[PDB]
Symmetry: C6
Subunit: 219 residues, 6 copies
């Protein structure tokens, strides 16, 4: 990654063993549960495109997902190149060349180049641009690997309301509902999908109940 040291200049630092192992172990343990994504983002704080490729290449299984991700990256790299075409032919001696999509993705750029862009005044933030492409891809994978529709999350007859709500919102998160819809669903599908006893209690509460209110009501 690129860090500020103890004296305020941005320098390259090697990716640490602890970060490398943390990422590999979260993918091993959680696969593409939605909470893997914020973990990836955090673990890649300050990353170069080299570092991001390191992290992705250290994954051993999930190769269908990693091929899907490559496809998304290639789509974004192609959109970059549409928006920001670069001069063909020789670079000015000693001067910084403009990055292409594949340079942002780390496949045609050197570490030195990357460092140069990321530490330019002002920075050409190749690591953040690439990390956004990656995360776009990873979100597609999360959606793909979500096993259950929201329509199929219904409260069992002896299921504590809290356990049902946990299932409900875990599902909505993997299915990638907007925050609008998660906020909204409390007045709709959450009640509809509740068991008869709790449905009756929630219906009587009236509209505008907070989730806390609904949860206390059906405790």
């Amino acid at each position: 990654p690129i860090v500020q040291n103890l004296q305020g200049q941005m320098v390259h630092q090697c990716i640490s063993p602890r970060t490398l192992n943390a990422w590999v172990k979260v993918v091993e343990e959680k696969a593409f549960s939605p909470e893997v994504i914020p973990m990836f983002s955090a673990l890649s704080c300050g990353a170069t495109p080299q570092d991001l490729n390191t992290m992705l290449n250290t994954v051993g299984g999930h190769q269908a997902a990693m091929q899907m991700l490559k496809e998304t990256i290639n789509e974004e790299a192609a959109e970059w190149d549409r928006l920001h075409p670069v001069h063909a032919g020789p670079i000015a001696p000693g001067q910084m060349r403009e990055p292409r999509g594949s340079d942002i993705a780390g496949t045609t750029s050197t570490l030195q180049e990357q460092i140069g862009w990321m530490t330019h005044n002002p920075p050409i933030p190749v690591g953040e641009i690439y990390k956004r492409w990656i995360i776009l891809g990873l979100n597609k994978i999360v959606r793909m690997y979500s096993p259950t529709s929201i329509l199929d999350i219904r409260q069992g007859p002896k299921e504590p309301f809290r356990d049902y709500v946990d299932r409900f919102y875990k599902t909505l998160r993997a299915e990638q509902a907007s925050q609008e819809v998660k906020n909204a669903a409390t007045e709709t599908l959450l009640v509809q999908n509740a068991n008869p006893d709790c449905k009756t209690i929630l219906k009587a509460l009236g509209p505008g109940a907070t989730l806390e209110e609904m949860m206390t009501a059906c405790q």
Copy 2:
């Protein structure tokens, strides 16, 4: 987080793998036992609003609680905006804009903005303001998830007084009794809820007994 480095200037540092894992593992192991909250506070020392969102987003289960928390945050953000309305329309070139509720919560502000506020002279402490909203929410969750009323903590016939007192005060903590009431309860409900043999001993001690005195008396 924002740290002072080895030379006394406040700079951004990436959240460490160790902090990220510590938080995820405490939620995994303790759920919303009350002692999770001081742990969250400590682990988020120096945090930006970005960091706080990272920590909260890395939680994989407990999604009913995380939706409740979002609701509390939105209520506090709305109260902020009531108290501190911001100018609509264009910001002064190069100048710091005033934060809105959603900027404090990290959803509409960049990391750079956050850094700017937190390192301003004097600081606009967006990470501490947000952390207070979070903790308000988390305390509600703790209360929600407390399984037992204080009224139902009664000393068994062969239960060592110390084990009863441990249950009693663990309950009072999750139920969120004030320190007044925890201090006071030693003269009241603690005795009332003691088994007959210990109740007799405690009654004879007289008023004003310290907890230590009561515990020695019923050992």
Copy 3:
């Protein structure tokens, strides 16, 4: 805690995940065995009153002990206030106010205030003052939770003398005998409580035997 950095000025540093986990795990594993206290002291090296409260608040069980500790702290805070009364009414603009008992205990003081006191020339050592109150309380808890009188530690008929001595001194430590008495007991209660065969050997050694001499004698 407050640390000297790499250039010799005292600055605040966040409590580390490793320190937070070390404390929680020692209480989990050892409860209030006497050796928990020096561990607490060491783990709280440099602590602010905020840090000390963090450590104590991260404990999840043992709430009878934690309520006893609060009581001891309140007694010491009251004695502080008797000895060092503070001016009522407004503080001099920009100037350091004098700490009250509850400010030393971290309940009515900010982190900034604490830092200010601890880094004043000369320091008002609020973290060390509070740590002493805490340790006074913790020593009471250790004594409370000591399960066995010294009078009941007697060497079994087939018990190796060394194993008996280990029990004996472990007990004396939890019971909180002075070093005088631990030094002295070798000529008295240690022999008295030895089995017949070893008692005979020790009696013949004469007075003034070192523990090493007694242990070799009964090997």
Copy 4:
């Protein structure tokens, strides 16, 4: 490795216990699964040729692979010497000598020499040159140890398409197909090797289907 310190000069630092253990444990756990290679590269960030030899020499099993690797290194070292012959006879007093293949590989050069080359202006990047030879060798080993042809990865009758695709691309990675072929295979061998039910669905999708599209189609 060679690091920039906190003040921007490149200095030697000892290889850390954590890096040494991370490498040994990845070889122990993963052998020569393809994802070991990016791990080796990352763990050897900044390495001297001494460090690279340390890492390779700390491996205890897999000695057929380590002998193959020595052979590849010797081939590359011989090609170096063909391309960059060095002056025979005495070096200029106090001056940097030119590296031979065996000096790049760390067998005839001192650590000091290595440091000298790597920190020269401009650097003679002996650690990166050697790391490339190593990785050339390791890729041969990965191919050698790949247990299954791509021709033999066929979707079972009750095998979820996603699990088949994972096997398929894991195989292609160990077999060392180019990215061309991995990108291309989605229109060919992937469909051909799919079970009858999914083959029918994929055939109907038409050409140009993304992997995501194919995976959704056969879910």
Copy 5:
């Protein structure tokens, strides 16, 4: 401990959690096997007398040994005071007082005092003086807890010579034979205590055989 920081001045640093846990776990796992002593020495590198007491006080079992150690420390402290008597009555304002035995042992000196002595030009090395007393005591404990005389280590009839030699020298180390005697024993007691078949082989080798020679001979 007292460390040089990144700029070459000697400053106090808190004892780390990792050092505190390492010591407690080595005593837990190895008790007073001889190799605990060099571990203690290494873990206490740079220690103040405060730190050494911390380490010793964090030990929970082995209280007969810890009382023996206190006795040895008191004997050395008394010998110090015989050799280096201090002025009674008031210290020169602002000036460093001379340490007494109990000040070296950390029982009557403050951390500040200790720091002062250890960082004086030239240092009064109170931590090294005390560490020597401690190690004198610990060596007595090792000898005490050694379970077997060297006379009783004899090679079994089917015991590999190497396993016998390992037992032999492990015993000699716990029994605290000088290096003279360990060097010498190869010509004497080692052969005498060997089984008949190996004894015959060793006798024929002649005098002056190295241990390596003896071990190869009886392989």
Copy 6:
């Protein structure tokens, strides 16, 4: 060890808990498998003779090996003293004395002396000189503890060629064959010791086959 700090001067640093534990655990887990030696070398990067003795003294078992090592060290120390005799009688006030064999080995030199030699301009590299003696000794131990002649490593009838080659080269490494012989053995003993089916295949390949070629041939 001696390190360069963050500002480029060579200073002493305490051996870390992590390094101390890493060494003890590798000896515990691997004994004197050949790969322990490069691990020892790496873990002792920058070591003083004090540090090297610490590492060796922290080993609890294997005392026959540790006595053999002492013997080798004493032989090298005696050869040093033959080559580099030192002045008898008093040292020049304030000046650096010349090291004797036992000073290099850390038994008659102080840490301060060692530091002085290692940081002299130019250095008298006592830690590297001693580390070479140690490694000479450890290599003898590895050879001693190698359980099997190369002559006895023969491919079983159903043993995969790769598994045989792994055994073969693991053996050659413990037996301490030169790289000449390991390079050469591929044309000789490796084939001779192969099972009949693979022997026939290898014989037909002709001379000059690489190991990779031989391994592919017999897959």
